[PDB]
Amino acid sequence: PETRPNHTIYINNLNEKIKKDELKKSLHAIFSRFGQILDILVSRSLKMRGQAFVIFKEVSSATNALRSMQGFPFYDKPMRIQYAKTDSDIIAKMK
RNA sequence: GGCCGUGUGCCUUGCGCCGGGAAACCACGCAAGGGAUGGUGUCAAAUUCGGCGAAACCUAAGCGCCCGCCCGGGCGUAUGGCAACGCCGAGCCAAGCUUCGCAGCCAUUGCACUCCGGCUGCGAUGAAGGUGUAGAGACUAGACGGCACCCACCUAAGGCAAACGCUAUGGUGAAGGCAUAGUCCAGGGAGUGGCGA
Ligand SMILES: [K+]
Ligand SMILES: [K+]
Ligand SMILES: [K+]
Ligand SMILES: [K+]
Ligand SMILES: [K+]
Ligand SMILES: [Mg+2]
Ligand SMILES: [Mg+2]
Ligand SMILES: [Mg+2]
Ligand SMILES: [Mg+2]
Ligand SMILES: [Mg+2]
Ligand SMILES: [Mg+2]
Ligand SMILES: [Mg+2]
Ligand SMILES: [Mg+2]
Ligand SMILES: [Mg+2]
Ligand SMILES: [Mg+2]
Ligand SMILES: [Mg+2]
Ligand SMILES: [Mg+2]
Ligand SMILES: [Mg+2]
């Protein structure tokens, strides 16, 4: 249902057809009114397909995205949203 | 269609040998013979532009030489030819591969930060191999070629085995297709004309 506070959020169960260059722009404008966004990682590989990571500036921007856009029908499919249990390599360089 | 020689290519044997390889066996340098060279299926495309190199054989202008000189001849001799054929640069190519773009189905609910599941469908791509390279040339199929597999034989590194050892993803089963089987038309047989010496 929910994991533990983190800047990055683990998203799965999505439409597995939209291209990498297209899906990055499909998440930019919709998930912007929560705060500053860092980077979005998308992979079409068998392990990572239908899965995406989204990183915000602060926890407040990440928690707002967790509640306001919870279970949004993204391309005819609702999305499962959890916090990333493992910290990203981007955040560790800043801390 | 058959004999007698010539050169070049080819394999076998016998011998050289800073080479690659674990070995088998490739690669080379040469010398002496023609006995020996698996199968089955599959692919039929690009076939273009230039350049380098060549023996046997054909020939003798220039040279030397001799007919005492000249006049004419005679001799040798490629730097002239033809050509088996050895390659090279660029473009291009059918399947089987190496890697990407898009579609389609079968899967998969998956926490990753460098990147990665299958199968058929074109399009693009690397590594072989081919074309270029036949008597001018043209078309047809095949194999002696490309690809996949099978068989025989050798070997045994890696893997397996406590171990005698076992096994190929390693090799070997010639070159021809610089036109091979064929059809076709060039060329000689069979004219005339140019160039050359
Ligand atoms: K002969
Ligand atoms: K050796
Ligand atoms: K050839
Ligand atoms: K062994
Ligand atoms: K020929
Ligand atoms: Mg024989
Ligand atoms: Mg044809
Ligand atoms: Mg004279
Ligand atoms: Mg005279
Ligand atoms: Mg002679
Ligand atoms: Mg000559
Ligand atoms: Mg040529
Ligand atoms: Mg031709
Ligand atoms: Mg042998
Ligand atoms: Mg040929
Ligand atoms: Mg020939
Ligand atoms: Mg022929
Ligand atoms: Mg004539």
Question: Can you describe what's shown?
Answer:
- The protein is α+β, with helices and mostly antiparallel strands.
- The chain has a single domain (1-95), classed as RRM (RNA recognition motif) domain (Alpha-Beta Plaits).
- 21% of the residues lie in helices and 21% in strands.
- It contains 3 helices and 4 strands; from the N terminus they run βαββαβα.
- It has helices at residues 20-23, 59-68, 89-94, and strands spanning 8-12, 37-42, 52-56, 80-83.
- Strands 2-3-1-4 form a 4-stranded antiparallel beta sheet.
- It binds potassium ion (5 copies) and magnesium ion (13 copies).
- It binds one RNA strand of 197 nucleotides through β1.
- The PDB classes it as rna binding protein/dna/rna.
- The entry lists the keywords group I intron, azoarcus, ribozyme, ligation, kink turn, Acetylation, mRNA processing, mRNA splicing, Nucleus, Phosphoprotein, Ribonucleoprotein, RNA-binding, Spliceosome, RNA binding protein/DNA.
- The entry is titled "Plasticity of the kink turn structural motif".
